[PDB]
Amino acid sequence: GPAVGIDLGTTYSCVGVFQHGKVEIIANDQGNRTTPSYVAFTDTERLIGDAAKNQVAMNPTNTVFDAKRLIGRRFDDAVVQSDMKHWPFMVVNDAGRPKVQVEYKGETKSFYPEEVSSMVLTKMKEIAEAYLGKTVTNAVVTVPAYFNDSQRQATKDAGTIAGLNVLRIINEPTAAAIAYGLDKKVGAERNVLIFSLGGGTFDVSILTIEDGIFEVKSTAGDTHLGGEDFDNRMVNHFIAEFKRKHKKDISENKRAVRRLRTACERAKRTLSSSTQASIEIDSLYEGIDFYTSITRARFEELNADLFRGTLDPVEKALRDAKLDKSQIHDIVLVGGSTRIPKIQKLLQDFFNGKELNKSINPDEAVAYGAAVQAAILS
Numbered sequence: 468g469p470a471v472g473i474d475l476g477t478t479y480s481c482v483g484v485f486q487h488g489k490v491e492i493i494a495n496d497q498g499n500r501t502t503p504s505y506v507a508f509t510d511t512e513r514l515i516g517d518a519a520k521n522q523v524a525m526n527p528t529n530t531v532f533d534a535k536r537l538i539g540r541r542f543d544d545a546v547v548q549s550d551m552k553h554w555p556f557m558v559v560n561d562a563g564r565p566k567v568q569v570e571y572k573g574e575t576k577s578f579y580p581e582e583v584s585s586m587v588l589t590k591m592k593e594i595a596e597a598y599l600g601k602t603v604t605n606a607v608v609t610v611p612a613y614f615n616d617s618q619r620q621a622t623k624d625a626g627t628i629a630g631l632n633v634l635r636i637i638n639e640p641t642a643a644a645i646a647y648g649l650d651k652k653v654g655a656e657r658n659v660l661i662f663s664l665g666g667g668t669f670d671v672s673i674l675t676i677e678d679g680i681f682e683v684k685s686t687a688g689d690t691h692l693g694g695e696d697f698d699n700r701m702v703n704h705f706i707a708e709f710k711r712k713h714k715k716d717i718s719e720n721k722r723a724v725r726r727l728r729t730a731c732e733r734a735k736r737t738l739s740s741s742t743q744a745s746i747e748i749d750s751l752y753e754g755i756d757f758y759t760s761i762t763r764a765r766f767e768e769l770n771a772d773l774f775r776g777t778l779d780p781v782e783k784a785l786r787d788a789k790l791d792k793s794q795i796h797d798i799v800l801v802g803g804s805t806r807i808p809k810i811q812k813l814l815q816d817f818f819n820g821k822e823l824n825k826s827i828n829p830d831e832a833v834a835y836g837a838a839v840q841a842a843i844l845s
């Protein structure tokens with residue numbers, strides 16, 4: 468069986484396989500090329516992926532996500548302490564190790580973050596197996612450049628418990644560079660900038676590649692800035708509109724809010740291609756249908772400060788790496804959020820018109836690169 472490349476993201480995961488000199492990004496059961504890093508526990512079953520996210524508003528306390536934020540950390544970890552204040556599921560301390568506590572089939576059960584991720588990993592494996600028509604064992608899993616040894620360890624373990632023989636754990640920016648072939652020897656040193664803006668995190672990495680060896684010269688970004696923050700701005704915008712039209716504040720109703728958020732996220736994707744999208748939600752609050760729409764222009768102004776602030780970490784990365792704008796040779800977009808036109812304009816304007824590498828779907832670039840690497844490693 469071929470070795471596969473797996474991008475284990477904070478919000479979405481993606482799997483690809485190298486076959487006949489071409490990389491195949493494998494779609495799932497619902498035909499999506501990336502699947503939510505969601506796991507859900509109910510009275511009768513364990514849901515994973517799309518099925519899990521498709522019922523989150525109906526089972527918030529038993530639907531787990533953001534496991535990538537817990538993986539490899541200690542319960543006492545300041546990050547953990549700050550984050551758990553926002554999760555609808557329980558996080559308990561087990562001799563210093565954080566554990567997620569959920570109710571499965573009427574019984575109370577807890578899981579280590581690596582066990583949850585192994586679940587998402589299992590779903591990717593079977594997605595690949597369903598496509599390949601053969602058993603998948605060897606794999607290359609990616610991890611952010613800033614992950615320490617514990618985090619890499621935990622990610623490796625999540626893979627082994629998923630029945631995957633992890634050939635190697637490589638950095639996400641490095642995988643991205645490999646996808647574009649920027650690892651090829653050209654008898655010269657090349658500076659590559661990876662701009663990764665996913666569903667929940669923002670990373671900027673400057674890699675220096677010479678003789679085929681990568682050297683992460685600098686990194687920056689924000690661990691709490693991603694596509695979900697954009698959705699939230701839309702949500703707050705529509706809560707206000709609903710109130711204008713029906714003098715009904717739907718903020719208290721968690722279900723209404725979550726249904727609207729899903730509508731927004733979807734409208735947002737449409738906005739990357741069209742100039743306006745419509746929000747059609749039957750019986751949002753009480754029995755009031757919420758039919759409306761947004762234009763790309765309004766979407767941009769709702770998120771203006773957020774989009775603009777994206778350049779702050781870019782400047783920082785440059786100064787730390789001791790390089791000027793003119794010194795970076797290539798720029799590659801990674802993450803679903805980079806499909807946003809305004810973000811592409813902003814970055815390009817910042818680099819005085821330089822062309823951005825974006826021919827490969829940004830949310831597939833990391834998996835794409837890992838698949839190539841997996842192939843060579845086997």
Ligand SMILES: Nc1ncnc2c1ncn2[C@@H]1O[C@H](COP(=O)(O)OP(=O)(O)OP(=O)(O)O)[C@@H](O)[C@H]1O
Nearest residue numbers: 476477478479665666667668694739802803804830
């Ligand atoms: N066409 C699009 N336009 C805008 N955003 C999009 C588009 N397609 C997907 N996205 C967004 O990209 C995000 C998911 O990104 P991606 O698949 O790169 O995540 P990820 O690797 O899990 O990232 P992170 O680990 O930072 O969350 C979601 O916020 C989704 O709404």
